[PDB]
Design a protein around this ligand. Structure first.
Ligand SMILES: [Cu+]
Length: 170
């Protein structure tokens, strides 16, 4: 008795907070990042935006909506997300939160990011190991992508992930 649908809750880049249930009826691309990457995110977000724009051009392919998610709150803001979305394009979506969100999400859904020690000198932040995930139109996941790729492998992989997950109404 009760559901309780394997939920989640994050802040919207305009000062609200969105639940798992709103995103139903879409394909959604989940990206784990932070508002201060030097030279990985400004490749990959533009690289993925070119794949999203290919799927605006090519008829019958899935409407892949991106979300960018902050992995640590000690350097972010909802107003920083609001810029990080819009100065790329208003088709972006920015999501943020705090410890008892991101920790209980990670306890429910185990995934890699490296919290490091330090003592005296002192570079290092957190490793964000360039993986992304496909969330789908009932609030379930399909599979992963990333590690090292570029648009020509992505559009064919999104076509193959589509041909695996399927429609129905066939
Ligand atoms: Cu990055």
């Amino acid at each position: 008795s009760f559901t309780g649908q394997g939920d989640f809750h994050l802040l919207d880049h305009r000062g609200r907070a969105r639940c798992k249930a709103d995103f139903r009826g879409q394909w959604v691309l989940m990206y784990f990042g932070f508002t201060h990457c030097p030279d990985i995110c400004p490749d990959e977000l533009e690289k993925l935006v070119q794949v999203v724009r290919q799927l605006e051009a090519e008829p019958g392919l899935p409407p892949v909506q991106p979300v960018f998610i902050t992995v640590d709150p000690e350097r972010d803001d909802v107003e920083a997300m609001a810029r990080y979305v819009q100065d790329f394009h208003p088709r972006l979506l920015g999501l943020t939160g705090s410890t008892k969100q991101v920790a209980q999400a990670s306890h429910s859904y185990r995934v890699y990011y490296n919290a490091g020690p330090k003592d005296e000198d002192q570079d290092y932040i957190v490793d964000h190991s360039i993986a992304i995930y496909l969330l789908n139109p009932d609030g379930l996941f399909t599979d992963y992508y990333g590690r090292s790729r570029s648009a020509e492998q992505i559009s064919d992989s999104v076509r193959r992930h589509m041909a695996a997950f399927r429609s129905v109404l066939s």
